[PDB]
A and B are shown apart, each in its own frame.
Chain A
């Protein structure tokens, strides 16, 4: 059993997944053809003899980047039924990607999913990779998650969205892509992520100490975060955290489902020989402000519930000893009515990294996924960037003729306005 599906909508979603499937083929011993010269029934299905195919439906509205996959080394793992290709994209428009152009091809992806979904009996969940600043992964997914949720009832759904920074941002109408994707954030995904482009560029030069961080090293680090949720399905361990065990510990309320990841040891290639990277250290590494995937500090916002997910040569005695010290700390403070906020899983495998990658071959690892109160201040950086562009009614004329209307723009503001307001309600004690 225990199988789950990947959908890579957008240029952000594909190139992230272009390394996420680089990583898994590396882990299980699978050459890129599909051959394995046990475990892999979370993302694969063995067909015939000596062939493994993934649960990879790549969706795009523009034929540039998918042809790179079809000519890259990973053209053989994938088979040409899988790769849905559009013609002419949304081009950072909403009402093209949702109301106009994706209406043609979304019937081609659903009846490609069900020829892959009804082949496994152990349906776990979905891994929908996108961004909040694209035109493909912006509001086309907002159509797509209102299709699988009608089909599949109350199954688990996990979106891994790249989120816009205040300072480093590479498009113009990005304060319009993020406000409209919220209606399929609180309603059609039950564990919704935020990852910043800014906050990883600080890590590539201060923790890994590389002067030129580009997208193929901004993203290989996200592949290790995805590969650690699924260490408990794909592998055994002393304590195991299933992907439905995960959400009941983590998510405390019917709407608050916004964790943020982090990871340790993110250290350089030759700084390993001197650092004494122990269980008391890498647990302590998960609370520095310089190990945040989102540009926010863990100090001004109080935590609610983290979920430590280790991997490697770890015994459970000292995880208690490492978490004993963190409870004695005074700045790392929790909301008071959740008197235990700790959940520990352990894999027995060594965490592995890509040959030609940027990280160091270590023998322990930790992937914290904390739900907290600081990240609602990573929304007032972007509500302000929306607040003036609609005030002068800028860029409205690209949306009116394409399907989008005005009355939703005043209406989708309360979709964010109450959402910042509720962390103020449940962050305060009494």
Chain B
């Protein structure tokens, strides 16, 4: 039944997911224990994609919850929806990655990697025929990158023919919260290119501007910065869980939007995004939503869509609509803004319509556009990398865990070649 198994590697990944499993449950009527209390039967027709029915009339999350420290686990258990998780899944050490890449990739997680890898093989057999690997992590610390890159290259050994979904928050120049953020990127460039099929790129920078301005809100906490990413990841997986007129599931999106073996970095998008005040001053319809979708200030990756082209956008509509109204709005924008799209690919839009909206609206959407403006986000990290390596600064925390000079020379050429492909085909 096209199942999806879920890994969360790192504190941000363990907190994006802890609300992602909160938002995905009230779609399906899951109580805080694990039983069904929903209303529509269309929930239970495909409930078995994120769930295993355990006996007694209960359900469990197919989720494998990875840290190297017990501190984040305690927040997971004692927080919202802790009890629903299966207590065999919490595979975690006691040491700590220390915000080192090589400690989560050569030293500490490297002797816990198999004890992760056999809770997923148990979850690989509660399913009829799986397809989904949701990995939620960072590019900021140790458990996000080094524990979240060795782990993908092990799942590729078992499954050379599934689809991989990273959800990778990126480092920004404005909000730079640690000191070695440029070292937790270029090392993880090397194996999120050639071993993942899609890679959503979310930033901490642009995700505050949505909270101050578009939502008109004064206190952006992380439980709101996550709670936007939760409602994007609750949107791409809608065709696996609900019927719709023009349906498009996870491979069907990923075959239309990815024209090349490497250019598969996406940015999300979500509409409506209104305050508690500007509710009554808005009238929900397809031109209401589609114009907000294509805004320059509704891209969570902190880049300007005006500074580049899109190659292949796609929108995933939800709610009872009419097709021509959705067809003509997508017809409108390729006519209106034909300079901002690629000239050698016709019909850039792949519509997807689901008959079920998010809970308690009239409609909603989810935007994903494989733009060219991603070429700027890596230059904001490639030049932060360029200074710190040129002095060979901070090199003694990495040579002391097994790394080498050679691992830093080749990794720049990998991030060199990536921006060398958006620009060559823009």
Residues of A whose CB lies within 8 Å of any CB of B are: 1, 122, 154, 236, 238-240, 242, 244-245, 248-250, 252-254, 305, 307, 315-317, 320, 324, 336-344, 426
Q: Which of B170-178, B287-295, B320-328 touches A?
A: B170-178
Q: Given the complex, which residues of B lie within 8 Å of A240, measured CB to CB?
A: 71
A339 and B98 within 8 A (CB): no
Q: Given the complex, which residues of A lie within 8 Å of B391, measured CB to CB?
A: 337, 426
A343 and B387 within 8 A (CB): no
Q: Name the 10 nearest CB pairs between A and B, nearest first.
A: A340-B176, A337-B387, A249-B179, A254-B396, A244-B98, A248-B397, A245-B99, A1-B94, A339-B384, A252-B393
- The verdict on A316 contacting B390 (CB below 8 Å), with A242-B96, A344-B177 known, is no
User: CA of A339 to CA of B94 in the docked complex: distance in angstroms?
Assistant: 32
B387 and A336 within 8 A (CB): yes
Partner of A253, one of B98, B387, B393: B393
B208 at the interface (CB under 8 A from A): yes
Q: Which of B214-222, B226-234, B345-353 touches A?
A: B214-222
Partner of B96, one of A154, A238, A244, A252: A244
In angstroms, how far is the closest chain B Cβ from the Cβ of A258? 16
Partner of A245, one of B75, B96, B388, B400: B96
B149 at the interface (CB under 8 A from A): no
Q: Given the complex, which residues of B lie within 8 Å of A239, measured CB to CB?
A: 177
Partner of A338, one of B75, B100, B383, B393: B393
B393 and A248 within 8 A (CB): no
Q: Given the complex, which residues of B lie within 8 Å of A337, measured CB to CB?
A: 387-388, 390-391, 393
A-B contact count, CB below 8 Å?
Answer: 81
Partner of A317, one of B74, B208, B394: B208
Q: Given the complex, which residues of A lie within 8 Å of B221, measured CB to CB?
A: 315-317
- The verdict on A338 contacting B388 (CB below 8 Å), with A315-B219, A315-B221 known, is yes
Partner of A316, one of B173, B222, B400: B222
Most-contacted residue by chain A among B74, B391, B400 (CB, 10 A): B391
Partner of B177, one of A338, A342, A426: A342
In angstroms, how far is the closest chain B Cβ from the Cβ of A248? 5
B120 at the interface (CB under 8 A from A): no
Give the nearest-CB partner of B389 in chain A: A337
Q: Given the complex, which residues of B lie within 8 Å of A317, measured CB to CB?
A: 208, 219-221
A343 and B178 within 8 A (CB): yes
Residues of B whose CB lies within 8 Å of any CB of A are: 69, 71, 74-75, 94, 96, 98-100, 173-182, 208, 219-222, 383-384, 387-388, 390-391, 393-394, 396-397, 400
User: CA of A254 to CA of B98 in the docked complex: distance in angstroms?
Assistant: 17
- The verdict on A340 contacting B94 (CB below 8 Å), with A252-B393, A317-B208, A324-B174 known, is no
Q: Given the complex, which residues of B lie within 8 Å of A242, measured CB to CB?
A: 69, 96, 98
Partner of B396, one of A1, A245, A253, A343: A253
Partner of B99, one of A249, A339, A341, A426: A249
B179 and A305 within 8 A (CB): yes
Q: Given the complex, which residues of B lie within 8 Å of A342, measured CB to CB?
A: 176-179
Partner of B178, one of A154, A244, A249: A249
User: CA of A344 to CA of B177 in the docked complex: distance in angstroms?
Assistant: 6
User: CA of A19 to CA of B404 in the docked complex: distance in angstroms?
Assistant: 45
User: CA of A253 to CA of B179 in the docked complex: distance in angstroms?
Assistant: 13
User: CA of A336 to CA of B386 in the docked complex: distance in angstroms?
Assistant: 12
B387 and A338 within 8 A (CB): yes
Q: Given the complex, which residues of A lie within 8 Å of B71, measured CB to CB?
A: 236, 240
Most-contacted residue by chain A among B69, B393, B400 (CB, 10 A): B393
Give the nearest-CB partner of A239 in chain B: B177
Give the nearest-CB partner of B221 in chain A: A315
User: CA of A369 to CA of B377 in the docked complex: distance in angstroms?
Assistant: 31
User: CA of A316 to CA of B226 in the docked complex: distance in angstroms?
Assistant: 14
User: CA of A237 to CA of B159 in the docked complex: distance in angstroms?
Assistant: 38
16 contacts between A and B (CB under 8 A): A242-B69, A245-B96, A248-B98, A248-B397, A249-B178, A249-B180, A252-B394, A315-B221, A316-B221, A320-B174, A324-B174, A338-B393, A339-B182, A340-B182, A343-B177, A344-B177
User: CA of A315 to CA of B74 in the docked complex: distance in angstroms?
Assistant: 21
In angstroms, how far is the closest chain B Cβ from the Cβ of A43? 18
- The verdict on A245 contacting B98 (CB below 8 Å), with A252-B394, A340-B179 known, is yes
Q: Given the complex, which residues of A lie within 8 Å of B100, measured CB to CB?
A: 248
- The verdict on A340 contacting B181 (CB below 8 Å), with A240-B71, A252-B393, A254-B396 known, is yes
Not counting A339-B383, A339-B387, a sample of 13 additional A-B residue pairs whose C-beta atoms are within 8 angstroms of each other reads: A122-B94, A154-B400, A242-B98, A245-B96, A245-B99, A248-B98, A249-B180, A252-B393, A305-B179, A336-B387, A340-B176, A340-B178, A342-B179
- The verdict on A341 contacting B179 (CB below 8 Å), with A1-B94, A248-B98, A254-B396 known, is yes
User: CA of A239 to CA of B15 in the docked complex: distance in angstroms?
Assistant: 12
Give the nearest-CB partner of A337 in chain B: B387
User: CA of A320 to CA of B175 in the docked complex: distance in angstroms?
Assistant: 6
Q: Given the complex, which residues of A lie within 8 Å of B94, measured CB to CB?
A: 1, 122
In angstroms, how far is the closest chain A Cβ from the Cβ of B138? 13
User: CA of A81 to CA of B69 in the docked complex: distance in angstroms?
Assistant: 34
